[PDB]
Amino acid sequence: DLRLHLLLNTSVTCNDGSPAGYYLKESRGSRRWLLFLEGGWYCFNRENCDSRYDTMRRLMSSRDWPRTRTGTGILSSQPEENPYWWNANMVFIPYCSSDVWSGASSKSEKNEYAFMGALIIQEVVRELLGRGLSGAKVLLLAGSSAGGTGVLLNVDRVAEQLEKLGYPAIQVRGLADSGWFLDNKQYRHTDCVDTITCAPTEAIRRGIRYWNGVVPERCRRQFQEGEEWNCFFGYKVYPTLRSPVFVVQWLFDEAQLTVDNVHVQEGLRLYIQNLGRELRHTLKDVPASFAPACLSHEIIIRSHWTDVQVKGTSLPRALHCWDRSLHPLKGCPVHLVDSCPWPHCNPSCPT
Ligand SMILES: *[C@@H]1O[C@H](CO)[C@@H](O)[C@H](O)[C@H]1NC(C)=O
Numbered sequence: 626d627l628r629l630h631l632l633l634n635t636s637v638t639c640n641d642g643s644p645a646g647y648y649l650k651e652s653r654g655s656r657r658w659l660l661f662l663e664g665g666w667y668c669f670n671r672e673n674c675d676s677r678y679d680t681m682r683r684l685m686s687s688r689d690w691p692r693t694r695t696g697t698g699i700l701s702s703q704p705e706e707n708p709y710w711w712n713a714n715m716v717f718i719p720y721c722s723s724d725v726w727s728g729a730s731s732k733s734e735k736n737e738y739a740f741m742g743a744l745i746i747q748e749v750v751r752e753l754l755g756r757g758l759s760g761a762k763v764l765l766l767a768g769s770s771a772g773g774t775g776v777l778l779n780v781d782r783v784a785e786q787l788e789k790l791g792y793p794a795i796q797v798r799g800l801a802d803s804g805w806f807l808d809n810k811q812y813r814h815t816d817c818v819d820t821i822t823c824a825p826t827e828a829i830r831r832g833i834r835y836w837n838g839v840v841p842e843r844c845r846r847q848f849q850e851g852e853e854w855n856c857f858f859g860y861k862v863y864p865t866l867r868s869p870v871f872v873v874q875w876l877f878d879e880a881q882l883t884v885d886n887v888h889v890q891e892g893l894r895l896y897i898q899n900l901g902r903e904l905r906h907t908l909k910d911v912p913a914s915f916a917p918a919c920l921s922h923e924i925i926i927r928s929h930w931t932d933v934q935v936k937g938t939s940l941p942r943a944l945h946c947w948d949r950s951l952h953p954l955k956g957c958p959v960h961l962v963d964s965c966p967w968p969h970c971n972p973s974c975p976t
């Protein structure tokens with residue numbers, strides 16, 4: 626199990642002002658640290674945040690959090706379940722800011738909710754340094770779905786934070802799972818008048834203003850003010866990053882299809898095949914990646930994450946090969962993208 630620690634700096638809060646926190650399982654024999662960002666969509670105005678507070682309150686508040694959690698998948702400490710990093714120090718950071726880990730605003734007389742995702746990550750890092758992170762050799766910032774996009778938005782800020790705090794020897798890297806979305810043409814279209822109809826670009830643009838959202842500096846400098854929503858899209862923000870980042874993405878991701886208004890005749894067949902091709906195209910110059918041709922969503926904290934293979938190579942193996950490459954390798958590849966054109970043309974896709 627991983628044990629809960631609420632942040633000692635209680636000014637860093639979840640949406641409703643309760644303290645944020647993290648779950649920790651230490652491994653005294655290891656200098657590797659894994660910090661995982663939970664996902665779970667987001668909200669972007671008073672009305673849809675109020676609805677989230679009624680039926681998704683654990684994603685907006687810590688008052689009902691349990692004292693422990695079980696680590697699964699890449700967060701498992703058993704080698705049977707986690708061939709990659711089973712002996713690492715394990716941290717799970719709950720997502721209670723509803724801001725895709727981008728926010729920097731407090732609850733106040735003018736703000737019904739606090740949006741402090743970017744500050745939550747920084748405060749977790751700061752408090753961990755006194756519990757052994759000061760002696761780390763690698764810090765891997767991982768995450769799934771909204772947490773995967775959160776890795777892309779924050780990995781270089783963690784690197785800069787540790788440099789400025791005086792720990793230049795810690796190597797910071799990122800693992801972004803199921804957070805590589807396309808602002809593509811949708812299969813059916815509606816103008817942005819409420820939550821359901823509002824396309825991701827328009828929703829994120831409004832969210833950034835509501836959250837006081839922040840993006841990586843080099844990406845901000847490219848797109849400039851008013852256009853920071855561009856930096857929430859993986860293929861646009863990744864070229865601006867300096868830390869090594871490994872990208873995991875199903876070619877036919879279920880959340881991508883949902884925001885494309887897809888739930889088979891010729892028109893839809895062509896649409897789905899073109900989505901797969903566009904995704905593959907955006908990964909062509911990503912040297913560390915794992916992209917199977919499946920209809921699914923998320924992978925790395927599922928207990929059977931070791932089952933899927935691309936070209937005969939599992940994800941735990943590809944991550945191990947990535948580790949080796951950061952010390953091309955004979956029979957130990959790091960770029961693994963399916964080329965077949967339809968969901969589950971890879972026989973190892975999840976059932
Ligand atoms: C608590 O966190 C806030 C937000 O980052 C920061 O402004 C403040 O200095 C912190 N307080 C302490 C005592 O570290």
Ligand SMILES: CCNC(=O)Nc1cc(C)on1
Pocket residue numbers: 664665666667725770771772774806857880881883884
């Ligand atoms: C309903 C589909 N889910 C999402 O769009 N989830 C997301 C999107 C981003 C960005 O972070 N989580």
